[PDB]
């Protein structure tokens, strides 16, 4: 199932060498392993939280000219 708890930004979002945006998140929930809810395009095939402790890297292709992770849901502007 989908992750039901909170995500926190572990590092400021940056542009990668291959023109995507890299989003490092840390999960706060009890339900890991779980699927990361993602809404704006997702580049990471199956963004999943393996362990609560382990931060995870998410890559996205931003459209020209807002990103939501989780469901107090993490909000990112680009």
């Amino acid at each position, epitope marked *: 199932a989908m992750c039901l708890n909170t995500f926190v930004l572990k590092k400021e979002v940056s*542009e990668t*060498q291959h023109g995507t945006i890299l989003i490092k998140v840390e999960y706060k929930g009890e339900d890991a392993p779980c699927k990361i809810p993602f809404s704006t395009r997702l580049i990471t*095939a199956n963004p999943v939280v393996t362990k609560k402790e382990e931060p995870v890297n998410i890559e996205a292709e931003p459209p020209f000219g807002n990103i939501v992770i989780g469901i107090k849901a993490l909000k990112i502007n680009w």
Partner: antibody
Amino acid sequence: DVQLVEPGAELVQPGASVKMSCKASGYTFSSYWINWEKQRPGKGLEWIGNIYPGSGTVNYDDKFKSKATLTIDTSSNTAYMQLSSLTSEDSAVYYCTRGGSHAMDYWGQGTSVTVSS
Amino acid sequence: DIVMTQSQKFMSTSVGDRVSITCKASQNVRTSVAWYQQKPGQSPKALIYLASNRHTGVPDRFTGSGSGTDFTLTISNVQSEDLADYFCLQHWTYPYTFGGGTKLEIKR
């Protein structure tokens, strides 16, 4: 002409640390990414990480987070890689390369690191 | 991480023949695949960018093809100078990963 200058060799003892340079010339240092690679004989090349001098962005392959430290000096157009807590597994040729949307384009001559007592 | 598989560790080819070196990605990398040539005691040289584009100065004998998961480097009219290790690299997402390489042996 794009050139990435690296020292030929480094001889270090187990448990020590080594810092190697990658001096860029023939292009604007702050406009391109620099990649760092490890190559052990008869082994698959590995990507250690990358660095963007124009912004200070550093990305590590998680496999090298406990081994490598990437830094830059825009004033001297130089990128550096430090390898610490050295073991024989770190004996390898370390390449820097210029990067971007087309991946590694120009590669340095590589620094051959020998870890031995 | 993405695994780039080059199943052929060695490929043997007669002078003047064509050789096709394969590179299989563990997931879809679109066209974000580069091919490099490495001769002994030398640094790798960039041959192909974005799966099918030849770098300036690279002979037209070298051709890159494929998308998704199946990539191929084709060398036509194989010469004594092509004796080298050829490897692929995916740069679709971090960490970038390389194929294990294919050593091209010239048959005589």
